[PDB]
Amino acid sequence: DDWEIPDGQITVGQRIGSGSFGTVYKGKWHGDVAVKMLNVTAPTPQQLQAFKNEVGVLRKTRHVNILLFMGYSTKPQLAIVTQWCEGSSLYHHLHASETKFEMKKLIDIARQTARGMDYLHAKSIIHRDLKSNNIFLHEDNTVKIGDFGLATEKSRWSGSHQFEQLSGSILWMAPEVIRMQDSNPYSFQSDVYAFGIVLYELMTGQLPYSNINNRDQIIEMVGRGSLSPDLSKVRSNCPKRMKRLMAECLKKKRDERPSFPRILAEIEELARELS
Amino acid sequence: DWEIPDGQITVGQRIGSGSFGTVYKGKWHGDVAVKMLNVTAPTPQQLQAFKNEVGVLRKTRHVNILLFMGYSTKPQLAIVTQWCEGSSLYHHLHASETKFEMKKLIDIARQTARGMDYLHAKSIIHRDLKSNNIFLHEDNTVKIGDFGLATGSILWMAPEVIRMQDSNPYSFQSDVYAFGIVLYELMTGQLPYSNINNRDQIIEMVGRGSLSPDLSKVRSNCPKRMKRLMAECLKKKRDERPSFPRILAEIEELARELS
Numbered sequence: 001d002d003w004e005i006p007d008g009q010i011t012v013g014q015r016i017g018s019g020s021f022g023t024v025y026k027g028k029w030h031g032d033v034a035v036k037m038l039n040v041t042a043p044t045p046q047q048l049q050a051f052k053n054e055v056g057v058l059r060k061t062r063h064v065n066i067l068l069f070m071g072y073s074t075k076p077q078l079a080i081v082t083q084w085c086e087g088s089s090l091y092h093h094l095h096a097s098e099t100k101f102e103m104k105k106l107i108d109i110a111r112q113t114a115r116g117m118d119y120l121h122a123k124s125i126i127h128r129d130l131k132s133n134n135i136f137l138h139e140d141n142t143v144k145i146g147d148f149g150l151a152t153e154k155s156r157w158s159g160s161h162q163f164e165q166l167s168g169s170i171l172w173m174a175p176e177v178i179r180m181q182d183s184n185p186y187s188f189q190s191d192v193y194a195f196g197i198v199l200y201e202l203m204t205g206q207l208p209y210s211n212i213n214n215r216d217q218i219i220e221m222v223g224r225g226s227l228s229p230d231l232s233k234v235r236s237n238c239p240k241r242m243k244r245l246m247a248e249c250l251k252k253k254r255d256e257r258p259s260f261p262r263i264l265a266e267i268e269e270l271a272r273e274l275s
Numbered sequence: 276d277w278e279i280p281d282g283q284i285t286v287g288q289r290i291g292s293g294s295f296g297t298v299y300k301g302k303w304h305g306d307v308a309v310k311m312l313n314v315t316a317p318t319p320q321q322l323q324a325f326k327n328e329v330g331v332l333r334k335t336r337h338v339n340i341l342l343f344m345g346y347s348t349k350p351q352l353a354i355v356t357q358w359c360e361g362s363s364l365y366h367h368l369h370a371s372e373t374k375f376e377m378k379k380l381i382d383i384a385r386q387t388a389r390g391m392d393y394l395h396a397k398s399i400i401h402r403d404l405k406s407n408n409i410f411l412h413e414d415n416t417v418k419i420g421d422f423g424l425a426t427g428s429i430l431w432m433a434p435e436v437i438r439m440q441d442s443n444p445y446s447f448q449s450d451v452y453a454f455g456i457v458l459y460e461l462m463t464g465q466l467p468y469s470n471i472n473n474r475d476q477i478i479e480m481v482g483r484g485s486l487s488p489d490l491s492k493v494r495s496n497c498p499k500r501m502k503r504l505m506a507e508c509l510k511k512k513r514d515e516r517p518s519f520p521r522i523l524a525e526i527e528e529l530a531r532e533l534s
């Protein structure tokens with residue numbers, strides 16, 4: 001295969017992070033790359049299948065707003081090679097750094113994120129974990145959507161042990177995803193809900209549910225339909241179109257949420273109005 | 276699969292002519308560029324050129340190479356890529372005469388060498404590298420393409436190429452020479468031979484080895500290692516020029532030394 005990179009070519013440099021996703025390094029290969037390695041010793045069946053699936057998903061993508069897949073290696077380690085992203089995630093900017101973006105820039109971040117997601121859905125790819133920490137602000141001018149924490153081990157059990165491991169994603173999980181009444185409750189429409197929460201973050205500067213003190217309460221109440229983000233907390237310069245669009249993306253009945261083509265078109269119209 | 280069904284792309288403003296056909300800005304999950312052949316039936320030559328271009332572009336996944344996104348065959352042959360925002364390096368250096376700091380000039384050289392190293396690793400010869408084919412996307416990321424008239428090549432032609440030595444005088448080393456001329460443009464802010472008035476004189480004298488770029492025009496803060504590298508890339512004899520892995524390594528090292 002054309003995207004396999006022979007052993008010896010990549011210089012694997014600094015370790016950036018390790019976790020349930022494997023280990024990510026900065027590397028050199030015709031310039032800067034990121035290298036995600038999924039095993040150290042002989043890979044398990046699970047690891048091999050996770051690697052094959054991730055390469056298969058990524059190889060379907062060629063879009064400016066989706067992390068650029070570049071290649072893979074299989075020996076001595078399973079490795080997925082992509083572009084290097086330079087900067088911080090949207091989550092890090094908004095919630096860890098007190099970055100103060102101008103509204104035109106908040107809308108551009110929304111617009112680029114919507115382009116990437118519209119593209120994914122056109123390629124029949126449900127992201128499954130859209131959230132502001134997976135929206136990379138590369139060189140502070142380009143959004144790159146990735147899945148920067150994809151767990152290699154998948155649980156077999158549709159259960160409440162899942163919520164610990166997915167604690168970093170609870171705020172972006174649609175109500176039907178929380179309730180898990182289907183064995184795989186993820187859809188294009190659950191990605192749209194997550195995008196609604198991102199809109200909330202951009203237009204309020206805050207995470208939803210900031211006054212709820214524990215995750216179990218969020219899980220219970222969002223599941224029951226008794227907790228919803230406080231939309232009144234949008235900043236005074238929030239455009240009217242964004243108030244409407246955010247409420248539509250957060251609709252409790254999944255089939256009432258708008259599609260990404262419609263979301264994108266609305267945000268493109270807004271951006272034109274502000275320019 | 277990369278075929279884009281008809282009707283999905285909104286074809287917008289006409290930008291210019293391409294290497295074949297016509298380039299437009301378009302909409303397709305965001306901005307794109309679309310190069311279309313606006314004929315009702317393509318010739319064998321046109322179909323082959325389309326196939327060769329899609330085939331080459333599909334082999335590329337690198338931040339410094341224009342991103343291929345898809346193609347269409349009906350009703351017209353079309354090649355779809357990312358839209359590049361900004362201007363070419365030619366435009367910045369020679370038209371706007373944008374005043375870049377030396378750190379940025381070196382970064383542009385470094386990014387161009389990454390893209391070219393990548394191409395040559397993928398067994399792709401560019402054949403028309405020049406500053407008009409180096410797009411400065413968002414004023415800071417190099418995208419190498421072959422933009423034709425959307426953004427004229429004798430100044431970048433190695434002596435063996437300009438003298439028409441044989442029916443196909445191109446090689447990785449003629450790409451290296453073209454890169455040497457891009458280095459010259461970056462480091463001097465000028466085109467080579469800016470004082471020579473006649474194209475035929477340039478063709479004759481560069482081919483013979485009696486005219487070469489005036490390296491005295493390099494800016495006083497051009498690092499010595501960059502000037503020497505440029506001179507190596509510009510060697511009149513093809514086989515004396517360095518490979519891109521060596522070029523890239525040298526630029527990476529000299530850039531590290533500056534900062």
Ligand SMILES: CC(C)(C#N)c1cccc(C(=O)Nc2ccc(F)c(C(=O)c3c[nH]c4ncc(Cl)cc34)c2F)c1
Binds near residue numbers: 016034
């Ligand atoms: C298409 C989709 C649904 C999206 N969207 C998806 C599905 C599955 C996985 C990924 C996915 O993105 N993989 C992946 C693979 C290799 C990596 F190195 C990294 C990775 O951490 C980085 C890749 N550059 C980086 N620069 C800087 C930093 Cl700090 C980290 C990285 C990575 F996240 C994306």
Ligand SMILES: CC(C)(C#N)c1cccc(C(=O)Nc2ccc(F)c(C(=O)c3c[nH]c4ncc(Cl)cc34)c2F)c1
Binds near residue numbers: 290299310331359422
């Ligand atoms: C891989 C290689 C050897 C390199 N390197 C190569 C070989 C052959 C052709 C091309 C090649 O680049 N094709 C191509 C196809 C479609 C286009 F729309 C355009 C195109 O003008 C643009 C694509 N975005 C653009 N943003 C802005 C503007 Cl002003 C123009 C464009 C284009 F140049 C590249």
